[PDB]
Paper text:
PB1 domains are protein interaction modules with critical roles in the assembly of protein complexes involved in autophagy, signaling, cell division, and redox processes, as well as the auxin-response pathway in plants. PB1 domains form homotypic interactions via conserved electrostatic motifs molded by basic or acidic surface patches on opposite faces of their ubiquitin-like β-grasp fold. While type A and type B PB1 domains can form heterodimeric protein complexes, type AB members can mediate interactions with either PB1 domain type or engage in homotypic interactions to form homo-oligomers or hetero-oligomers. Our cryo-EM structures of filamentous p62 and AtNBR1–PB1 assemblies revealed that the presence of a tandem arginine sequence in the basic motif of type AB interfaces is required to stabilize a polymeric assembly.
Of the three PB1 assemblies studied, AtNBR11–94 (AtNBR1–PB1) and p621–122 (p62-PB1) formed homogeneous filaments of constant diameter that appeared best suited for high-resolution structure investigation by cryo-EM. Image classification of segmented PB1 helices revealed that both AtNBR1–PB1 and p62-PB1 polymerize in two different tubular morphologies: a projection class with a ladder-like pattern, we term L-type, and a projection class with a serpent-like one, we term S-type. By indexing the layer lines in the Fourier spectra of AtNBR1–PB1 filaments, we concluded that L-type is a two-stranded helix with a pitch of 77.2 Å and 11.47 subunits/turn, whereas S-type is a single double-stranded helix with a pitch of 68.2 Å and 11.55 subunits/turn. Using the derived symmetries, we determined the 3.5/3.9- (L-type, p62/AtNBR1) and 4.0/4.4 Å- (S-type, p62/AtNBR1) resolution structures. All four structures form tubules of ~120 Å and 150-Å width with an inner diameter of 45 Å and 70 Å for AtNBR1–PB1 and p62-PB1, respectively. In the absence of prior structural information, we traced the AtNBR1–PB1 de novo. This de novo-built model is in close agreement with the 1.6-Å crystal structure of a polymerization-deficient AtNBR1–PB1 mutant, which we solved in parallel. The main interactions are formed between a double arginine finger formed by two neighboring arginine residues in strand β2 (R19–R20AtNBR1/R21–22p62) stabilizing strong salt bridges to acidic residues (D60/D62/D64/D73AtNBR1 or D69/D71/D73/E82p62) in the OPCA motif located in the β2–β3 loop and the α2 helix. These interactions are assisted by the canonical-type B lysine (K11AtNBR1 and K7p62) in strand β1. In addition to the canonical transverse interactions, the helices are further stabilized by longitudinal interactions Y14AtNBR1/N28AtNBR1 or K102p62/D92p62 and R59p62/D93p62 to subunits of neighboring strands along the helical axis.
Numbering used by the authors: 5 to 92
The structure:
């Protein structure tokens, strides 16, 4: 019945917000729902490209591209997700 704490950080200011999950177990948003949510925090122009890369369990710098890999963050069993923004 619990959320995933997501911390993002662009222009060297870390932020943090939470995202709930269903009863079923998947995250209750998608990338188009996510990337326009990040553009709210940072006052970025939404037409700009975002290059979002999270952290794996065993420390790789993975890419995010699709709602297929957002499913994987639940099964990855991470304590809090961290997503870096690279624009322009």
């Amino acid at each position: 019945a619990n959320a995933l704490v997501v911390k993002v950080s662009y222009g060297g200011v870390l932020r943090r917000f939470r995202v709930p999950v269903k009863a079923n177990g998947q995250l209750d948003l998608e990338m188009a729902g996510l990337k326009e949510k990040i553009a709210a925090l940072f006052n970025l122009s939404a037409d700009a490209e975002l290059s979002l890369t999270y952290s794996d369990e065993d420390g790789d710098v993975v890419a995010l591209v699709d709602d297929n890999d957002l499913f994987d963050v639940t099964n990855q069993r991470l304590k809090f997700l961290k997503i870096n923004v690279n624009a322009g």
